[PDB]
Amino acid sequence: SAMLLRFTKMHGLGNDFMVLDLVSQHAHVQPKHVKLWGDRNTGVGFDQLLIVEAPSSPDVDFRYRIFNADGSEVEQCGNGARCFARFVQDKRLTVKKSIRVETKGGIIELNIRPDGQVTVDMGPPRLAPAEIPFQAEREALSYEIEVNGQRVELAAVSMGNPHGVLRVENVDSAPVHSLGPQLEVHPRFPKKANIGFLQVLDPHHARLRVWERGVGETQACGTGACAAAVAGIRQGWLQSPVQIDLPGGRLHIEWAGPGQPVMMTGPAVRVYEGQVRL
Amino acid sequence: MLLRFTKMHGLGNDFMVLDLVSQHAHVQPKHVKLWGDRNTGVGFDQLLIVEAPSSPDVDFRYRIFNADGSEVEQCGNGARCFARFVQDKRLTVKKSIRVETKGGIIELNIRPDGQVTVDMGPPRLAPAEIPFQAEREALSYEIEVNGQRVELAAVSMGNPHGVLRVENVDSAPVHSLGPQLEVHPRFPKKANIGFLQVLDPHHARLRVWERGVGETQACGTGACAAAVAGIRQGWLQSPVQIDLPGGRLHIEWAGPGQPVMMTGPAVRVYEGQVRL
């Protein structure tokens, strides 16, 4: 029963994390704590809490768990892996550059690069509409959808959560805050969807804004960047590798095509070191 | 170099607090912007810097900065965090503190229960001072606003306030009427709009539409204005407990020309270290 817990505040392109080393510290963090610490007015303030633990499994380097500020063990945009990797390196918990980490969904493989960015294996995309889930007659590269009188062409992709991706001529003037929420809860998305607005600059470079399910516009949705790159490659607009500029900064997406994993590379930054009493 | 800071809040108005008496650092607008960002920084509503006073007859100086860089002149929540900060970091052993601020020297008192009492100064009630367009000073004014009629009190605590009485703050039209009255042409410089529910002469609930901000949850000057408005109109009697969304304040006011004394909490959240 420690007096206090040491933590590091980190962010991956503006998605901000409270990170805890529970390898070296012993404590049982209760849901109560997640909710107290997550509050931006009266707490530390974070999008997610990331807890690093000893591998409860062999041939794995670490375990981690991710909680949102409301206490639930959900991680929509999948950027926490990069903060984890930079954290265990920065805190000298490992000298490995290729790290295998046990997570809720399975095993994440990641690699820390010499320039300090982190490449994360995000798994293959799911493209069959009913699996996304999305209502359509058959799998297609693009779907026509009627949204309160507007006909939109939307690609639908799952990175483990549902995404719809629409191409825009101009990401800065795109209707993110108007059409985002209309598509997010469209009946054809029975579990709702993250909605990406994708501006193609050339086959290897795009700009992206994402309306995140349940949240609104975010600085950098990793799985959204993955989905948008996949959607653009499938339609021939993009070719791997794709540099994707988000409001929070730049991600690099690699995808060799159907059935192959999407690889996401980007930065993760330390903001400050903190101590919070239990 | 590595700077120590403390995160505090007063009724959910959250502060990064820096002791630059014991630490030597040149903090420039660029740092305030970087640290104040909620996505990439510490995250705060305001940065409070504690520094050495210019007068040896004053205990401390502080400066308060918004996340966007601009400096604040008076901030009741910040004064309460400042007081508990200098006490708990052992920078003073006094309970009655005088501090140099951008708006003059203010007197603070740390109570035995750990809350802090701030001298907020007297209210200004004449319309020209608010500023508020009115024929004469009055306890309340009837306003025609977009086909509606509203009765509000107008008070200045250094900034303008309009205060409306409501039967229940939870059903008050804070998001509807708030912005309509905020920019009403009879408030030349806009106004903070308070919605006041009287429980008894000594107890009330409040919600505040802050000008150029919206519903704020922790507007201490709004609580002062609402208590003053209610006391002048006889619905309340000093001292008044004011329940805001962020928590409870206690207001004392002896009447016209006398300062409003505001008492509330200040809470330490965590300790941090940031590279400058």
Swiss-Prot record, chain B:
Entry EC no(s): 5.1.1.7
Q: Which Pfam families match?
A: DAP_epimerase
- Supply one GO molecular-function term: diaminopimelate epimerase activity
Q: Where is the active site?
A: 75 (proton donor), 219 (proton acceptor)
Q: Where in the cell is it found?
A: Cytoplasm
Instruction: List the GO terms this entry assigns under cellular component, sorted alphabetically.
Output: cytosol
Q: What is this protein called?
A: Diaminopimelate epimerase
